[PDB]
Amino acid sequence: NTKGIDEIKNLETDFNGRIGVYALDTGSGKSFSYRANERFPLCSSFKGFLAAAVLKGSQDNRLNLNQIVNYNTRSLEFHSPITTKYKDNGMSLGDMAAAALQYSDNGATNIILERYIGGPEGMTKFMRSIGDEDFRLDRWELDLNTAIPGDERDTSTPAAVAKSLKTLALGNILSEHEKETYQTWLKGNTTGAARIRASVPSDWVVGDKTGSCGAYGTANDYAVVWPKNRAPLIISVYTTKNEKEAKHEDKVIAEASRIAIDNLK
């Protein structure tokens, strides 16, 4: 069989779940896919796209990243490490968007969705505008994390996530300046050490956004990877299981990424 497919099938069997992967070498055009067209829960991974929406809004001069966002009278959501620190004085819109991505800050995520993006509908509309027909955000944090098998709410496909990431980080939707900011934010992510970052050599640079639902062993990660002296790669790995109480496996995500990188054709 084609290189890497049997290896990922065996990984999936041992994991006793479902693994979706899409990888693309932007230099040669070679790719690797496995269940790339199947739906998987997004979990926090959509926050990486939320940040890009804010950058697009700044670029259109509809928003200003320097605008101070005040929320001193708003109860903050579970897991709001950055927004809790600056609740008294407030935070600039740019810093809030960065926190939503880099720390998966829920307060930052919901505040931005409520005030600037137009909620789940607005987030979905933004993705449709960049050519993404699969992405769908239906709920807010933290309800969107249920990850119920068969449920199409708050899901997308590994292929759609990869295409949207390539379009936003390396395409022409965002200007040269906004792309640099977006790439900097991705590189500064603090939650992906054990996933895609663990599958590549020490001298390769990685920009990513993780997602962990906390249910049905559902976890994921997508990234722009800049290999030493090579054009960037786009990697998207999504996983889920049928047991409600099953824990996610970071090592499975890392291994699926390693297999994809070594089998680009």
> Which residue shows structure tokens 């579970």?
78
100-127: b (≥16 Cβ within 10 Å) or e? bbbbbbbbbbbbbbeebbebbebbbebb
CA distances from 104 to 150, 213, 220 (A): 25, 12, 13
Q: Is 51 exposed, middle or buried (0-12, 13-18, 19+ CB in 10 A)?
A: buried
Is residue 179 a known part of a binding site?
A: no
- Spot the catalytic one: 31, 33, 44, 104: 44
Q: Quote the CA–CA distance of 69 and 50 in Å, as a whole number.
A: 16
Is residue 73 a known part of a binding site?
A: no
> Which residue shows structure tokens 């505008």?
129
Q: Phi/psi of residue 149, each to 5°?
A: -55, 135
The size of the chain, in residues, is 265
Is residue 171 a known part of a binding site?
A: no
To the query of whether residue 44 is one of the catalytic residues in this protein, the response is yes
Of the candidates 138, 140, 152, the one whose C-alpha atom is nearest the C-alpha of residue 240 is 152
- 113 alpha carbon, distance to own chain's centre: 16
Structure tokens at 61: 């001069």
Q: Which residues are catalytic?
A: 44
Q: Could you list the residues known to form a binding site, using ranges.
A: 209-211
Q: Could you list the residues known to form a binding site for substrate, using ranges.
A: 209-211
